[PDB]
């Protein structure tokens, strides 16, 4: 019938039919399994909880993310999420609707090939396509030229595009993302004292980071202000009922993006990687890429991130070049929106990977989707 | 005059002057208060017994550890312990000798600040220093590169160091330690029947664990052998006079370290944490850290723990990398020996925290001493 877009992220699965303006079902990409004893009060249970159900009763489960840094590690778990989405969230038969996938750039070819084989054999998808997340974000933005910074839960890549001609040599991929920020918040919440170790407590830390954390315009000045007994101290309520206070940890958790040396990573910050990616293109392209900086992904939703990175780029970039950053309010679902736009295009209907092509070329056929 | 090192552990306080090869006074970190009535029979009495005196007559006291899990919670009890040490064990005036303290890594800044303020105000130490226990253990070992697994009574951390450059991002901290093992032995001694509920009976269970418990090379094989009516059954004589028999509980109490799921802990075993800490370092550091696995702490004195840890890590580690575990006979006082070595160094004499620095910077001055 109609195509469905399933953007399987590294911590948040977003799926829905093509042509819609928002994903139909958004649930965490979590598979939870029982941890405690073999059940006393037992009448009707399951051996594994997938998605929102796992997080609902996470107190007795060991949540495990199948996808780490945009790379699928547990294939049985990923199959579980795919089946759960197709048969409980969209509630449609996968054998009738073509499926469009998203994959981070500079990813192993084995991962994409195995994903293609799994969804094309376990399910009976008539036609499957795999596209880069940054290209989909640019499609959602509505323009054809610009540089996309898709900072998701597991990966932070940067694909510059000019007039629809993507440059596959200035693409810079960073492994710093929401999961690393959550881990850093777990590590540095020990300072005041409140420490979280279990996976459910990791989800609690992720919620704390989502709700309270923000990006400081000036790190040193904000740190001095916080140390000077200022009002930068918010209170969060744990599920057990205890209130915790977050001081300078608010702007130190997402400062790792601009300073990866916090967790001992040699790579430069997101602003420096973006500037390097811009400077790796032709001299006639940098002017247009500077004024069309596009953000996407969940972790780009921190308050003040756009101003901070604009200031950093303006410091790095020449003063005579105008620096503009595009931060739409729908940054969380920008990749899915772009996928929905692309899948409904009349020209894109010929770019699918039909069943006959897969049968005649085996499962090493997804290598001309290169963007 | 001469500096003194006071390694206040979470269950055993070791103190002594710098330059010595062994602590001068080792007594339990226990503060006990009378539980029963004052009673007519009184010729001289104290409202609280500290240290070995509390354990000597522990039949009429409710012993309370000031430190557990590496944090002091009762600061009055800690003040009492420090005063008892300085004025009865070392028998020296604290105002004349600088004091060096040890603190577990990944600990609240508030706790260390409070300890600094207490020792600089209640006592008048001319200088003071707070150091990480694993760094002191590496100092005692005499080498500059290696990974230290310091498993004390309340904490079990793991700090990897290469050429004296500690990596403060691969440090893994675990809360499985001697107190948790003692509690587990108390819980599973119910199986045979001999159960101990009070704090003095908890000390008895701790003595049983110290004297009889050991780590099995193969847990399943040892369990089958014990269930097959083997000779793994040793007899312990309680102070009341009744002998008890310990069967498979000998190697099940310290198996919690390699299987935290026994007491419902989501974290992984000490071998897995060590492997993860090694794998979190640079690829050029892993080879040297594999062959320099330094072990310290009291609970690493179980018979056969070194062989079991080496076997588990070799199973985890690649087969082409040589694995060597260093377990010196002085593992119990390794931290204190390293502290004594460091405090007597000519270079370390400039890194103290003088009273003038504390006065000009307040209690919140110990934050440049991070290791």
């Amino acid at each position: 019938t109609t195509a469905l877009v399933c953007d399987n992220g590294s911590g948040l699965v977003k799926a829905g039919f093509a042509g819609d303006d928002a994903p139909r079902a958004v649930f965490p990409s979590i598979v939870g399994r029982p941890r405690h004893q073999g059940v006393m009060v037992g009448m009707g249970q399951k051996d594994s909880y997938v998605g929102d159900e796992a997080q609902s009763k996470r107190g007795i489960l060991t949540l495990k993310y199948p996808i780490e840094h945009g790379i699928i590690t547990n294939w049985d778990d990923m199959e579980k999420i795919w089946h759960h989405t197709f048969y409980n969230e969209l509630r449609v038969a996968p054998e009738e609707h073509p499926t469009l996938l998203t994959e981070a750039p500079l990813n192993p070819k084995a991962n994409r090939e195995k994903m293609t084989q799994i969804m094309f054999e376990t399910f009976n998808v008539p036609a499957m396509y795999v596209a880069i997340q940054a290209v989909l974000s640019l499609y959602a933005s509505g323009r054809t030229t610009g540089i996309v910074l898709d900072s998701g839960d597991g990966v932070t890549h940067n694909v510059p595009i000019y007039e629809g001609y993507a440059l596959p040599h200035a693409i810079m991929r960073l492994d710093l993302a929401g999961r690393d920020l959550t881990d850093y918040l777990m590590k540095i919440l020990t300072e005041r004292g409140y420490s979280f170790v279990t996976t459910a407590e990791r989800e609690i830390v992720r919620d704390i980071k989502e709700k309270l954390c923000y990006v400081a315009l000036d790190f040193e000045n904000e740190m001095a202000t916080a140390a000077s007994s200022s009002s930068l101290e918010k209170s969060y309520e744990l599920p057990d009922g205890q209130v915790i206070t977050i001081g300078n940890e608010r702007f130190r958790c997402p400062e790792t993006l601009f300073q990866p040396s916090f967790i001992g990573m040699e790579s430069a910050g997101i602003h420096e990687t973006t500037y390097n990616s811009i400077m790796k293109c032709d001299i006639d392209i940098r002017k247009d890429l500077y004024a069309n900086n596009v953000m996407s992904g969940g972790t780009t939703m921190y308050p003040g991130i756009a101003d901070r990175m604009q200031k950093e780029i303006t410091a790095l970039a020449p003063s005579t070049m105008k620096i503009k950053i595009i931060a739409p309010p729908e940054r969380k679902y920008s990749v899915w929106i772009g996928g929905s736009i692309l899948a409904s295009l009349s020209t894109f209907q010929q770019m699918w990977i039909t069943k006959q092509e897969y049968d005649e070329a085996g499962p090493s056929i997804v290598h001309r989707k290169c963007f | 005059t001469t500096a003194l090192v006071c390694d206040n552990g979470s269950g055993l306080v070791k103190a002594g002057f710098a330059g010595d090869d062994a602590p001068r006074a080792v007594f339990p970190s226990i503060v006990g208060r009378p539980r029963h009535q004052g009673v007519m029979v009184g010729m001289g009495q104290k409202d609280s017994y500290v240290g070995d005196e509390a354990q000597s007559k522990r039949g009429i006291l409710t012993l309370k550890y000031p430190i557990e899990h590496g944090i002091i919670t009762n600061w009055d009890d800690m003040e009492k312990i420090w005063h008892h040490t300085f004025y009865n064990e070392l028998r020296v005036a604290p105002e004349e000798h600088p004091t060096l303290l040890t603190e577990a890594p990944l600990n609240p800044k508030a706790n260390r600040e409070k300890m600094t303020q207490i020792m600089f105000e209640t006592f008048n130490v001319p200088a003071m220093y707070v150091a990480i226990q694993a760094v002191l253990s590496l100092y005692a070992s005499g080498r500059t590169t290696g990974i230290v697994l310091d498993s004390g009574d309340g904490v079990t951390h793991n700090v990897p160091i290469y050429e004296g450059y500690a990596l403060p991002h691969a440090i893994m901290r675990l809360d499985l330690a001697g107190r948790d093992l003692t509690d587990y032995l108390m819980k599973i001694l119910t199986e045979r029947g001999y159960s101990f509920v009070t704090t003095a009976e908890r000390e008895i269970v701790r003595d049983i664990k110290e004297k009889l418990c050991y780590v099995a090379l193969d847990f399943e094989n040892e369990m089958a052998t014990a269930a097959s009516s083997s000779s793994l059954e040793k007899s312990y004589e309680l102070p009341d006079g009744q002998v008890i028999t310990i069967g498979n509980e000998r190697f099940r109490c310290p198996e919690t370290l390699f299987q935290p799921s026994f007491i419902g802990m989501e974290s992984a075993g000490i071998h897995e944490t060590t492997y993860n800490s090694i794998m979190k370092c640079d690829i050029d550091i892993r080879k040297d850290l594999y062959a320099n696995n330094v072990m310290s702490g009291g609970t690493t004195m179980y018979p056969g723990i070194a062989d079991r840890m080496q076997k588990e890590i070799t199973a985890l580690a690649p087969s082409t990398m040589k694995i060597k575990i260093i377990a010196p006979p002085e593992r119990k006082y390794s931290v204190w020996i390293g502290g004594s070595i460091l405090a007597s160094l000519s270079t370390f004499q400039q890194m103290w925290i003088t009273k003038q620095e504390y006065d000009e910077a307040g209690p919140s001055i110990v934050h440049r001493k991070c290791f």
Binding site: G193, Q242 | E68, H69
Partner: peptide
Amino acid sequence: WXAXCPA
């Protein structure tokens, strides 16, 4: 501790 674990 204050949040998580006792200490």
